[PDB]
Structures are given as structure tokens and as C-alpha cells.
């Protein structure tokens, strides 16, 4: 059981597994509660990607920094920014300094960059959580593989805008990948380009889908490169995020995404009291005994 | 509400002068629209609560600036806002220093005053120079009340400040929603279980013209570029000379009231009720408006609670916004 | 440390009007420099709402007579408003209109010989400067007086400050009489007696407090 | 475009005592001076509007709202409806004893909301200025002061001027209203000349108050009493819960039964 598992067709196809129930439960909402956008279009109309395989391309890192700057200027209370690899976060935050960007991100919010010490990460997390509560703005940028996004969960006002930089592919690792893929071709029947896309999307949607605790929590969750729009990679995000991924939001610009973020936060900072939920996204004692509600709950859940 | 209200009300307005005031989300930049609605706010607040006062701080470049001191006449405040259109809005704000100046003035107002601060706050980096949870603990203990009207976002620190000091936090969609929020903060907000219910000693000075063609008068200049005042308003404590009433006594500490200024805010205490709103035709044997003797050419008929007469939409808006009483229940 | 000196100075410099005041008080031999710089640093259910209904307006003479008059007036006005509408004849006699124009002409009744406001603008500017100095000075004096005065603060330190206020008050009256003699003996106009009203009320509150506290001795 | 709203204090008891007085000046010349002022106001300009309200003792019924005898035609129809409306009002009437003093707060309330709806009728090119004449002849009841101030402040906000011709007795609340709203107050010294007072002082509109030299403003008394002994106050004690004027200091606040914190 997990909050993200997608697609469910592949866990019987890996684990030698035959279940009774293969179930996906749709996010039924009385309020939009999240918006995913795929910011895959630079402000210069540069195609945002990570095709270079961690060997830096300058203008794409420029547009990443521009995204982080303007999303800092819009979003409250803590932005979480997942990179691809620690070499790539190393190189990106390197070239956000020689290029004149990172002081402006300082002017809007307080950075807490990650390191692979076990104690320095915990101190950076503690100051990041003491800066989302003592007035100022805090922005935690990490790697989408490590322990930062495995247990350490970001709740109502600690991450409002989970910025997934890049598509996380395991690129550093050796012939263990080639050999596990040759195995999944041969003795299971799962393709090369199927398993790579599955692994990348389970890591990306794993690190994204931590921002939301309940119905009264709202998380902007942006995906920043063009590859998340290409049908197979978008097709393997879970159903409760594809349901709220609009075709207009598909392949936004930076500034169109910033304006969608502003309209999102303004429409979703108003009093959304408990009395707006008893119809749709909540149930009382006596709202259960009605068989019309039973028909509704029959219509919500689906299987695979 | 039929609840206790804070009717003497030293409110204190803290405006941003941030970098984010220059953003163009509103139709002019946020400084201009915010300042225009504060001009409307000072107008309606002095139009509705006469005893109370306002003070305006622009918060600019990590420092706080007491732009207009805590006084009770709209001329100085609106003059200062017409001046403050011309400002620059450079730098990041400072919530620490602005709440410190507002606290520093609002320590020593007497305990029955619901001491209130209204922070019209836009940006997100809340650049304080010290710890701002000890201020919130102090302002919790100093029984002040701080309410923040926010632009573009929800910020956790302003949420903690609003829910802990006692105020209310709100974020802005439009021109109309922002007018609704400032109109919500015009009215006297209800009191907690903490504020003192004292009995302030008051003074009611009569008007005195130049007595009998100035036969043994007392020719004075003023008391706060003044001419030679022949007569006017005295004080019953210190026997000074004031031109305008109501004015807090500048040399005694008495508060001077003409007493329609107590009658200008009596509608809060015996308030209105709801109009039973019914759109359809529905049994109406009284075709004409009991308000202004006109036909009901629309499908909205509004019927009072006690007398249960008939009113139209124009009489609805007029009674519930301005006249503040049912014309039937007087009869 | 000579801190205070540097403060009062820096101020006097930046604030020349205050400097003026400082001279007009200290240099004028009314008080001493040290004193001046020293002290210059819940369901509300209303019980009786009828008290709100007829408010602070005093009780007018409202004596409607015996209810026989109710019946008599109802009879006479029900008979009155039956026969109605003369429009040419009854409305105006022309002599009443001529007397009304006589009244509203500027020498008759309802023209009160009002909005006259006879002023004494003879020597404006330098007398205005004198009065600016005087009202600043007496404002500071009565500021200290009525600021320490109001609550009796029944101990010996506040009573000693009240005695210093009494000394400053008497020498303030002497300096005000000297300023009135040096000012108003130029062209014989411009009653300054409002400042003397303020200082006479300070004099009166001082003697009335003295008699009150001497009654409160035992 | 202007809007005069005459309010005539038709106290049947007062004008009944006036008509048993057998004077020259009865209610007929009062309502006729009202109609001549109304036809004069409609006569001064084509765009002017008129509305005439009559405060009775128990009701605020409006009076307003071919040429047989030579008037202008709409003046004739307006005079016919005002005459027939006062004949339907005053003759067919009632008698009660607990409520016999006249009212003025309700008729002013109807006038305020009438000016509101007639200002919604106005299109974007033109703009409406407005005033309320009050022709008072009776003694106002004190009991509606809580109400009465409210309509004054409505006329303070809605920028409606208030004027008053009082006939017999002075009225502190109504000269108070004409002081607050910016209107004008006048106590007539001789009854039958009433029309000639109205056609020079109260006929001219807002852009003729500033041109004409008018009778000067009487000084307005801001007398204030306690709710305790009704006597005049120069220094009072006012609660911050009840917001009520007390004269002498008392332990337990009577107006709102406040558990008064004592220091
Ligand atoms: Zn005083
Ligand atoms: Zn009613
Ligand atoms: Zn109506
Ligand atoms: Zn009380």
C-alpha cells in the first residue's frame, strides 16, 4: 500500500505476484487541493530538459534558476526543490553563484542546500523548519534519491510548491542497470524503455506527493522539464495527479506557470471551513446510511 | 452579534513599503490601490467610530517609520496618504520593528481600549532583525490585537501572529474582495475574555460663542498657523480652548465628547435583525413597499421579523447599510 | 557624563522653537534648566436601554394637557379636512408678503444682525510671533502642571513636584505679566487675556487643591 | 436635476388646537403654502422633481406621488392628487391615546430611502442633488431620539441636506439635524407670511445657498445630560460597555448591570 504506486500493472510483473485486488482510489474533492503543472518551456522559449546527462547546459540551468526565483517571489512558507543527482545539484548551485542568481533567491527566501552528511542534513532541515515558522521564507533543495525525501515528510505549510527539477534517471550506476534490464527483457517480459520510465516516474511522483496531508492542505507541485508531457512518462504518474493535470497546464511556460500559481494561491487561501465539505469531500454519521452515498462510493473506487 | 464590542479603539495601520508593493497584480501597482482603499478606510472609520484614532506606519527597507501619529481627525491622515502616493517602496519589510513601534505607542493607552493593529502585508520574506516569537508572546501579554490583510499568499508567521494575538488573517482576490475585507475591519470587532471593562472619565464641553458681542470675553489663539479664536469649545477639566470636538484633552487626559458622538455609534448595541428574504409572489396582499410606497416590480420581497411589513431591494440596502433601523418597528 | 547637555543642545539646535521656549522659561527666571530638561523625556445584555432612547438631550418642557383635548382635536380636525382646496384666495394676503420681505430685508426680524465678526487685525505679524512664543511656553507650563496635577498621588515626592510646579506657576505669572507689559504697550490693542485665563485657572486649581488637601489633612 | 422632499408635520391635535384658536392661519394655508412651494419648485426647471410626505400621528403616508383653470397641466394633476390625498388622510382618521405625539423619524426614513431609489433611477450623464424640507409645527417626542440621530447620520452619509421651518416651538433635535447635515434652520416669527419665507430661504437650491445672503446661523446647544437625573453635564462618567452617560460616579453600572472592576 502506498500513496503513489503507478502503474499497478508492473508489481505483479516483477514480484512473481498474483493478487486478489489491484485497486486505485480517485481523489474526490470539493476544492482543487493541488495543481500539477509541467513547466517545460523556458521564458526565452528554450526547451527545458536534462538531456545532456549531467554535463551542464548553461541556458537550461539559467531557466531553472529563473523558475526558482520567480516561484520564490510567489509561493509562501517553504519551497522544496528536488534535483536529479548530488553531482547535478552540486553543479547547478555552483553555476547559480558565478551566474548572478542565488543572491536574489536569498533576497526572497532563505536557502538550505543539502549535503551527504548525516548530521548536516538534519541541521539544515531543522533550520528550514524553524524558518517556515519564524516569519521568513525557507526553501529546501535536495536530491530526489536520498533520505531527505524518503521519510522526512513535508506537511501543511512546510512545502507549498514541490519543484521537481528534471526527470530522475539513474544515470551514474553501472552495468547493474544494463543487467537488470537484460533480465527483465529475458525472463520476465518487461521492456527496456518501459522499466526506465517506470523507475523514473516512481521516484519523481514519490518525491512530489509528500506535500499534501489532508483535504485542507494545498500543494503546488510543479514538474520542470518537457519530458513529463510525453504521454508515457505522464501516463505513469498516479491517477490522483493525472486527474488534476489539465491540457492547458500541460507544457506551460515559466511565467504562465507563475500566473497559474498566483491564481491558485489566491483562490485557495480563503476560508474553506468544515461546512464546505459535508456535502462532497466528507461524511457524517448519518450521511453514510443513505444508499445514494453508497452508489457514490461504488462510483469512486476502481480496480486494475 | 449581541456581544461586547471594542468601541474605544486605537487602531494602528502598518502598510508595506516593500519591493512587492510595486508589483502590478492590481490595476495600478499594489501601493496605489492599497493606499486608495486606506483613504476610503480612514474615511469610513472616522465616519462610523468618532472616539477612536488611527496611526499609519510605512514599513520600508527593513526598518519601520511612524508616518502619522495616533490622532483622531481624517485630515492629517488623508493628507499624509496623498503624500505617500509619491513614495519609492525600496527594500524588504520588517514586521518586528513595525510591531515594536506600534507596541511602544500602544503600551500606555488605557486598558479599556481595544488596542488594534492592522497590517496590510504583501511580501513573503519577513526580514526581521530579532526573534519575532518573543514579540508575539509579549503582545499576547500586552493584550493588543493584530489583524493582517495579506497579498498573494498565506504566510505561516502572519498566521501564527493572527491566531495568537487574537486577530484575523485574510488574502486578497480582487478590488471588490479587498474592499469587503477593509469594510470588515471598519466595524468594531468583538472582545475576548481578556480586555478590561473600565469606566473612562469623560467630559462634555458645551459650545461657547463670543459671549455677548465679546462683552468681557477671553481672546485666545488656539490649542493645536492659527488665528485669533474668539470663542468655541472649552474643557470642563483644565478650562482650555479647543476649536474642534471630539478631541482628547492635550493637557489633562480627559476625553471630550459632544454626545451625538456617543449617539453616532449606538446602533452597534441594539443592532438590526435579519430580513426574511423571499423572491416569489407568495400571498402578498400588501402590494406596495412599506418603505417608500412603490410597487414591487421585481421578484424579491423582504419582510422584517417583528412588525413583518414589506420592503423592496432599495429599501433593503438603504435600511441595512445606512438608516440602521426598521421603519416599521419605530411606529 | 555630560549626556543630557548634549541632548537638550542637539534638540534646541534642530528645534529652534523649542530653544525659544527653553529661553522664555529658564532664561526668563521662571524655572531652572535641570527641571525643564528633566521632565521632557462577553455577553453585553443592556439593562436600561430607555436611557439610550432619549439620550443626553435635557428634558424639554413637554406637558400635553388632559386627554379631553385629544377628543376635541380629533373632532375639529376630522371636521376640518373634509371641505378643502382654496388655492387663489386663501393662501397669501399681499400685505403679509410685503411684511415678510420687510423682515427678510437686512434690517428686520430673522436677519439677526449676525455674521458680523468684527476683528482687530491691526498689527498682525509680530504680535502673531509673540503669541506663538507665548502659547508654546504656557502650553509647556500647563503641560507639566495638568500632567502631574490630576490624581493627587498622595505621597511626599509628588507633593514636592507639585510645590515646584507652584513655584514655576507663580514665576510664570510674573513672566506673563512682564511679557504683557512689554508687548501690549505699543499701540493699545490685542487683549492677551486668554493666556491670563489659562494661568488664572492654574492659579485657581492650585489654591483649590491646597484648600482641598488642607481639608484632607485630618 | 434636483429633489425637494417636503415633510409637513400634520399633527391633527396641534392643528386642531390651531383651528379652535380661530386664528388667521390654519392647516389649509399650511398645505396650500406647501403646494405653492411644490409648484414653484417644479416651475423653476423642467428636470426638477417633487415628493411631499405628511407625518401623521400613526402613519407616514405620502401625499405626492386636463387643465381646467389655466395652470400648467402636470402642476394641476399634482395639485389634484395632493388635495385628494390629504382629504383621504385627515378626514378618514382614527383615535388612540397611548401614542398621540407626532413622529418625524419614520417620515425622514422614507424620504432617505426614496432619495436612494430615485438616485438609482438617475442615468450616468446627469447627477442628482437632494434635500429634505421639514415643516414642523408640533412638539417632538423625546422617546425616539435613539432612532432620530440615525436618520441624521444617514443624511450625513447620503449627502442629503436638511432644512427646517419650525412654526410654533423650537426643536433641539431638528436644529441639531440642520446643524449636522449642513442644512438650515428657521423659526418663523409670524405665521401667515409662511410662503414668503419659503420662497426666499427654502426654495433656493444648493447652488443658491452660496449666492444669497440668508438669515444667520443660530448657535447650536450641545447640551448633554445623564441617564440618571436628566440634568445638565459639563463633566460626566461614561461606561465603556454600556456606552451611557452617568453624572456622578457610581459603583455598579445600572445601564448594563456591569460587574464593574474597581480600582
Ligand atoms: Zn483638560
Ligand atoms: Zn420591523
Ligand atoms: Zn421601497
Ligand atoms: Zn455600562
What SS3 string covers A248-283?
CCCCECHHHHHHHHHHHHHHCCCCCCHHHCCCCCCC
Residues within 5 A (CB) of ion ligand 4: D 239, 241-242, 253, 255-256, 258
Q: What is the helix (H) or strand (E) element at residue C8, kind and residue range?
A: helix C3-14
Is B163 touching D (CB cutoff 8 A)? no
Q: Which of residues 117-146 of D touch B (CB under 8 A)?
A: 117, 120, 144-146
Contacts of B147 (CB under 8 A, 6+ apart): B116, B117, B118, B119, B162, B167, B168, B169, B185, B189
Contacts of C46 in chain D (CB under 8 A): 242, 255-256
Nearest residue on chain B to A137, judged by CA atoms?
A: B125
Q: Which of D13, D171, D201, D243 to mutate to test the interface with C (most CBs of C within 10 A)?
A: D13
Contact indicator for B132, A133 with CB cutoff of 8 Å = no
Query: Are B292 and D117 a contacting pair at CB < 8 A?
Result: yes
Calpha distance C12→C36 (Å, rounded): 12
Q: Which residue has the cell 491566531?
A: B163
Nearest one of A237, A80, A225, A104 to A161, comparing CA atoms: A80
Calpha distance A140→A117 (Å, rounded): 15
Angle at C175 between CA C169 and CA C178, to 5 degrees: 145
Calpha distance C90→B325 (Å, rounded): 41
| Other Cβ atoms within 10 Å of C17 Cβ, number | 11
**Per-residue cell: A226:** 518537457
Task: Measure in Å the smallest separation between the Cα of C106 and chain D Cα atoms.
Answer: 9
What residue spans define the domains of chain A?
Answer: 34-269
Residue-level length of chain B: 331
Contacts of A250 (CB under 8 A, 6+ apart): A38, A229, A234
- Across the A:B interface, residue pairs with CB atoms under 8 Å apart total 69
**Omega into A7 within 30° of 0, i.e. cis?**
yes
Query: Are D114 and B292 a contacting pair at CB < 8 A?
Result: yes
Alpha-carbon distances of A142 from A161, A171, B222, B302, rounded to whole Å: 14, 17, 68, 61
Nearest one of B153, B146, B121 to B34, comparing CA atoms: B121
End-to-end alpha-carbon separation of chain C, Å?
46
| Buried/exposed A25-63: b ≥16 CB within 10 Å, e otherwise | eebeeebebbbbbbbbbbbeeeebebeeebeeeeebbbb
Is D90 touching C (CB cutoff 8 A)? yes
Contact indicator for D20, C76 with CB cutoff of 8 Å = yes
Torsion of CA B36, B41, B42, B46, to 10 degrees: 150
Touch criterion met for B and A (3+ Cβ pairs within 8 Å)? yes
Is B24 touching A (CB cutoff 8 A)? no
Calpha distance C183→C189 (Å, rounded): 10
Q: Which residue has the cell 480600582?
A: D263
**Per-residue cell: B202:** 469623560
Calpha distance C72→C95 (Å, rounded): 33
Contacts of C54 in chain B (CB under 8 A): none
Query: Are A75 and B124 a contacting pair at CB < 8 A?
Result: yes
**Per-residue cell: C57:** 438631550
Backbone angles phi, psi at D8, to 5 degrees: -105, 120
- The rounded Å distance from CA D253 to ligand 4 centre is 5
Contact indicator for D73, D66 with CB cutoff of 8 Å = yes
What would the DSSP string read from start to end of A150-166? TT----TTT-SEEEEES
Contacts of C45 in chain D (CB under 8 A): 256-257
DSSP 8-state code for residue A220: E
Nearest residue on chain B to A156, judged by CA atoms?
A: B156
| Other Cβ atoms within 10 Å of C88 Cβ, number | 8
3-state DSSP assignment of residue A108:
helix
Alpha-carbon distances of A93 from D78, D97, D170, rounded to whole Å: 85, 90, 84
Nearest one of D54, D134, D111 to B315, comparing CA atoms: D111
3-state DSSP assignment of residue C153:
coil
3-state DSSP assignment of residue C144:
helix
Calpha distance D55→D10 (Å, rounded): 6
Residue-level length of chain A: 304
Touch criterion met for D and A (3+ Cβ pairs within 8 Å)? no
Contacts of B154 (CB under 8 A, 6+ apart): A76, A77, A157, A265, A269, B169, B171
End-to-end alpha-carbon separation of chain B, Å?
24
Is B98 touching A (CB cutoff 8 A)? no
- The rounded Å distance from CA D241 to ligand 4 centre is 5
Could you please state the CATH topology (level 3) that the domain comprising A34-269 is classified under.
Rossmann fold (3.40.50)
**Omega into B246 within 30° of 0, i.e. cis?**
yes
- The rounded Å distance from CA B284 to ligand 2 centre is 17
Task: Measure in Å the smallest separation between the Cα of B140 and chain D Cα atoms.
Answer: 21
DSSP 8-state code for residue C25: I
- The rounded Å distance from CA C91 to ligand 1 centre is 55
- The rounded Å distance from CA B47 to ligand 3 centre is 26
Is C146 touching B (CB cutoff 8 A)? yes
Q: Which residue has the cell 474533492?
A: A29
Ranges of beta strands (E only) in A119-253 are 138-143, 161-165, 219-224
Nearest one of B14, B16, B55 to B32, comparing CA atoms: B16
Calpha distance B245→B256 (Å, rounded): 7
Calpha distance C195→C138 (Å, rounded): 8
Task: Name where chain B breaks: residue before each gap, C-N > 2.5 Å.
Answer: 224
**Per-residue cell: D59:** 402613519
Query: Are B125 and A136 a contacting pair at CB < 8 A?
Result: yes
Contact indicator for A134, B157 with CB cutoff of 8 Å = yes
Calpha distance C21→C31 (Å, rounded): 12
Contact indicator for A84, A57 with CB cutoff of 8 Å = no
What would the DSSP string read from start to end of chain D? -EEEEEEEE--HHHHHHHHHTT-S--HHHHHHHHHHHHHHHHHH-TT-EEEEEEE-SS-EEEEE---SSSS-HHHHHHHHHHHHHHHHHHTS----SSS-S---HHHHHHHHHHHHHHHHSS-SS---EEEEEEEE-SPPPGGGHHHHHHHHHHHHHTT-EEEEEE-SS--HHHHHHHHHSS-EEEE-SSGGGHHHHIIIIISS-HHHHTTS--PPPPPPP---B-SSS--B-SEEEE-SSS--EESS--SSBTTTTB-----
Task: Name where chain D breaks: residue before each gap, C-N > 2.5 Å.
Answer: 65
Q: Which of residues 42-61 of D touch B (CB under 8 A)?
A: 58-61
Contact indicator for A166, A84 with CB cutoff of 8 Å = yes
Query: Are B228 and C143 a contacting pair at CB < 8 A?
Result: no
DSSP 8-state code for residue B194: S
Contacts of C135 in chain B (CB under 8 A): 221-223
Alpha-carbon distances of A114 from A120, A149, A152, rounded to whole Å: 8, 12, 13
Contact indicator for B165, D226 with CB cutoff of 8 Å = no
- The rounded Å distance from CA C135 to ligand 1 centre is 16
Calpha distance B33→D163 (Å, rounded): 38
Query: Are B125 and A265 a contacting pair at CB < 8 A?
Result: no
Q: Which of residues 11-30 of D touch B (CB under 8 A)?
A: none
Technique that determined the structure:
cryo-EM
Query: Are B314 and D59 a contacting pair at CB < 8 A?
Result: no
Calpha distance B170→B162 (Å, rounded): 10
- What is the edge-to-edge ordering of all strands in the sheet holding B255-256? B255-256, B201-203, D235-238, D245-246
Interstrand relation of D184-187 and D129-136 (parallel, antiparallel or unpaired):
unpaired
Contact indicator for A130, A70 with CB cutoff of 8 Å = no
Nearest one of B12, B25, B104 to B58, comparing CA atoms: B12
Contact indicator for B120, B34 with CB cutoff of 8 Å = yes
Resolution for this PDB entry, in angstroms: 4.8
| Other Cβ atoms within 10 Å of D93 Cβ, number | 16
Q: What is the helix (H) or strand (E) element at residue B57, kind and residue range?
A: strand B54-60
Amino acid at each position: 500500500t502506498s500513496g503513489t504506486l503507478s502503474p499497478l500493472d508492473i508489481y505483479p510483473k516483477i514480484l512473481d505476484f498474483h493478487p486478489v485486488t489491484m485497486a486505485t482510489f480517485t481523489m474526490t474533492l470539493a476544492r482543487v487541493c493541488l495543481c500539477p503543472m509541467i513547466i517545460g518551456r523556458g521564458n526565452d522559449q528554450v526547451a527545458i530538459s536534462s538531456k545532456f546527462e549531467t554535463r551542464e547546459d548553461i541556458a537550461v540551468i539559467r531557466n531553472y534558476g529563473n523558475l526558482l526565483l520567480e516561484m520564490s517571489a510567489v509561493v509562501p512558507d517553504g519551497i522544496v526543490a528536488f534535483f536529479t543527482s548530488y553531482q547535478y545539484m552540486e553543479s547547478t548551485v555552483a553555476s547559480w553563484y558565478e551566474q548572478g542568481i542565488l543572491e536574489n533567491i536569498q533576497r526572497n527566501k532563505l536557502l538550505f542546500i543539502e549535503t551527504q552528511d548525516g548530521a548536516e542534513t538534519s541541521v539544515a532541515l531543522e533550520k528550514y523548519q524553524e524558518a517556515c515558522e519564524n516569519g521568513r521564507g525557507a526553501i529546501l533543495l535536495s536530491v530526489a534519491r536520498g533520505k531527505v525525501s524518503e521519510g522526512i515528510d513535508f506537511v501543511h505549510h512546510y512545502g507549498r510548491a514541490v519543484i521537481m527539477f528534471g526527470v530522475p534517471y539513474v544515470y551514474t550506476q553501472s552495468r547493474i542497470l544494463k543487467a537488470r534490464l537484460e533480465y527483465l527483457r529475458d525472463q520476465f517480459q518487461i521492456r527496456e524503455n518501459d522499466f526506465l520510465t517506470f523507475d523514473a516516474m516512481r521516484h519523481a511522483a514519490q518525491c512530489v506527493g509528500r506535500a499534501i496531508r489532508g483535504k485542507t492542505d494545498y500543494g503546488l507541485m510543479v514538474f520542470a522539464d518537457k519530458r513529463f508531457a510525453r504521454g508515457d512518462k505522464r501516463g505513469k504518474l498516479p491517477r490522483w495527479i493525472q486527474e488534476h493535470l489539465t491540457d492547458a497546464n500541460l507544457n506551460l511556460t515559466v511565467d504562465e506557470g507563475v500566473q497559474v500559481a498566483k491564481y491558485f494561491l489566491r483562490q485557495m487561501a480563503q476560508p474553506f471551513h468544515r461546512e464546505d465539505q459535508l456535502g462532497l469531500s466528507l461524511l457524517s454519521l448519518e450521511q453514510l446510511e443513505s444508499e445514494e452515498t453508497l452508489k457514490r462510493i461504488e462510483q469512486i473506487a476502481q480496480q486494475l | 452579534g449581541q456581544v461586547r464590542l471594542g468601541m474605544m479603539r486605537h487602531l494602528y495601520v502598518v502598510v508595506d513599503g516593500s519591493r512587492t508593493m510595486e508589483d502590478q497584480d492590481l490595476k495600478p501597482n499594489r501601493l496605489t490601490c492599497t493606499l486608495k482603499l486606506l483613504e476610503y478606510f480612514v474615511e469610513e472609520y472616522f465616519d462610523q467610530n468618532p472616539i477612536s484614532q488611527i496611526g499609519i506606519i510605512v514599513t520600508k527597507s527593513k526598518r519601520a517609520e511612524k508616518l502619522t501619529e495616533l490622532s483622531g481627525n481624517p485630515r492629517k491622515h488623508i493628507t499624509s496618504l496623498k503624500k505617500a502616493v509619491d513614495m519609492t517602496c525600496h527594500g524588504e519589510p520588517s514586521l518586528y520593528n513595525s510591531l515594536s513601534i506600534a507596541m511602544q505607542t500602544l503600551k500606555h493607552m488605557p486598558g479599556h481600549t481595544s488596542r488594534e493593529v492592522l497590517i496590510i502585508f504583501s511580501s513573503l520574506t519577513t526580514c526581521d532583525p530579532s526573534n519575532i516569537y518573543d514579540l508575539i508572546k509579549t503582545l499576547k501579554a500586552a493584550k493588543i490585537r493584530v489583524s493582517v490583510i495579506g497579498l498573494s499568499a498565506e504566510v505561516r508567521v502572519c498566521t501564527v501572529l493572527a491566531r495568537e494575538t487574537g486577530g484575523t488573517y485574510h488574502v486578497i482576490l480582487d478590488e471588490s474582495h479587498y474592499k469587503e475585507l477593509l469594510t470588515h475591519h471598519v466595524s468594531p470587532p468583538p472582545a475576548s475574555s481578556s480586555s478590561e471593562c473600565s469606566l473612562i472619565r469623560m467630559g462634555f464641553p458645551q459650545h461657547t460663542i463670543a459671549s455677548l458681542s465679546d462683552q468681557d470675553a477671553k481672546p485666545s489663539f488656539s490649542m493645536a498657523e492659527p488665528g485669533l479664536t474668539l470663542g468655541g469649545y472649552f474643557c470642563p477639566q483644565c478650562r482650555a480652548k479647543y476649536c474642534e470636538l471630539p478631541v482628547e484633552c492635550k493637557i489633562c487626559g480627559l476625553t471630550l465628547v459632544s454626545a451625538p458622538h456617543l449617539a453616532r455609534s449606538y446602533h452597534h448595541l441594539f443592532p438590526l435583525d435579519a430580513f426574511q428574504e423571499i423572491p416569489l409572489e407568495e400571498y402578498n396582499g400588501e402590494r406596495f413597499c412599506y418603505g417608500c410606497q412603490g410597487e414591487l416590480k421585481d421578484q424579491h420581497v423582504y419582510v422584517c421579523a417583528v412588525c413583518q411589513n414589506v420592503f423592496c431591494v432599495d429599501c433593503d440596502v438603504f435600511v441595512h447599510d445606512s438608516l440602521h433601523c426598521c421603519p416599521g418597528c419605530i411606529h | 557624563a555630560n549626556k543630557e547637555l548634549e541632548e537638550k543642545n542637539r534638540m534646541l539646535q534642530e528645534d529652534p522653537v523649542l530653544f525659544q521656549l527653553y529661553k522664555d522659561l529658564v532664561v526668563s527666571q521662571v524655572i531652572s534648566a535641570e527641571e525643564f530638561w528633566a521632565n521632557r523625556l462577553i455577553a453585553l445584555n443592556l439593562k436600561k436601554s430607555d436611557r439610550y432612547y432619549h439620550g443626553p438631550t435635557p428634558i424639554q418642557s413637554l406637558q400635553y394637557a388632559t386627554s379631553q383635548d385629544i377628543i376635541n382635536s380629533f373632532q375639529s380636525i376630522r371636521q376640518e379636512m373634509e371641505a378643502y382646496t382654496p388655492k387663489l384666495t386663501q393662501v397669501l394676503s399681499s400685505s403679509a408678503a410685503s411684511s415678510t420681505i420687510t423682515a427678510l430685508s437686512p434690517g428686520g426680524a430673522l436677519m439677526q444682525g449676525g455674521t458680523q465678526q468684527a476683528i482687530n487685525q491691526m498689527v498682525p505679524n509680530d504680535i502673531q510671533s509673540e503669541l506663538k512664543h507665548l502659547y508654546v511656553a504656557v502650553g509647556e507650563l500647563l503641560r507639566h502642571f495638568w500632567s502631574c496635577f490630576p490624581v493627587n498621588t498622595p505621597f511626599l515626592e509628588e507633593k514636592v513636584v507639585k510645590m515646584k510646579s507652584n513655584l514655576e506657576r507663580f514665576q510664570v505669572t510674573k513672566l506673563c505679566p512682564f511679557q504683557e507689559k512689554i508687548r501690549r504697550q505699543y499701540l493699545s490693542t490685542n487683549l492677551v487675556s486668554h493666556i491670563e485665563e489659562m494661568l488664572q485657572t492654574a492659579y485657581n486649581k492650585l489654591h483649590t487643591w491646597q484648600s482641598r488637601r488642607l481639608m484632607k489633612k485630618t | 436635476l434636483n429633489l425637494l422632499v417636503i415633510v409637513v408635520d400634520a399633527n391633527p391635535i396641534w392643528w386642531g388646537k390651531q383651528a379652535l384658536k380661530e386664528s388667521q392661519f390654519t392647516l389649509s394655508k399650511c398645505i396650500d403654502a406647501v403646494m405653492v412651494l411644490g409648484n414653484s419648485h417644479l416651475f423653476m426647471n423642467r428636470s426638477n422633481k417633487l415628493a411631499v410626505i405628511a407625518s401623521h400621528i400613526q402613519e407616514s403616508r405620502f401625499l405626492y406621488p386636463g387643465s381646467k383653470d389655466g395652470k400648467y397641466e402636470l402642476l394641476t394633476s399634482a395639485n389634484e392628487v395632493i388635495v385628494e390625498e390629504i382629504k383621504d388622510l385627515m378626514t378618514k382618521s382614527d383615535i388612540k391615546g397611548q401614542h398621540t405625539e407626532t413622529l418625524l423619524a419614520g417620515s425622514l426614513a422614507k424620504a432617505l430611502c426614496y432619495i436612494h431609489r430615485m438616485n438609482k433611477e438617475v442615468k450616468d450623464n446627469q447627477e442628482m442633488k437632494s434635500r429634505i424640507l421639514v415643516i414642523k409645527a408640533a412638539e417632538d417626542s423625546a422617546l425616539q431620539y435613539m432612532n432620530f440621530m440615525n436618520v441624521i447620520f444617514a443624511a450625513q452619509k447620503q449627502n442629503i441636506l436638511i432644512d427646517a421651518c419650525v412654526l410654533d416651538s423650537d426643536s433641539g433635535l431638528l436644529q441639531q439635524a440642520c446643524d449636522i447635515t449642513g442644512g438650515l434652520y428657521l423659526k418663523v416669527p409670524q405665521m401667515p407670511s409662511l410662503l414668503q419665507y419659503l420662497l426666499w430661504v427654502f426654495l433656493p437650491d444648493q447652488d443658491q445657498r452660496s449666492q444669497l445672503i440668508l438669515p444667520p446661523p443660530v448657535h447650536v446647544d450641545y447640551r448633554a445630560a445623564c441617564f440618571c437625573h436628566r440634568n445638565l453635564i459639563e463633566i460626566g462618567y461614561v461606561c465603556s460597555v454600556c456606552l451611557s452617560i452617568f453624572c456622578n460616579f457610581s459603583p455598579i453600572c445600572t445601564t448594563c448591570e456591569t460587574a464593574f472592576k474597581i480600582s
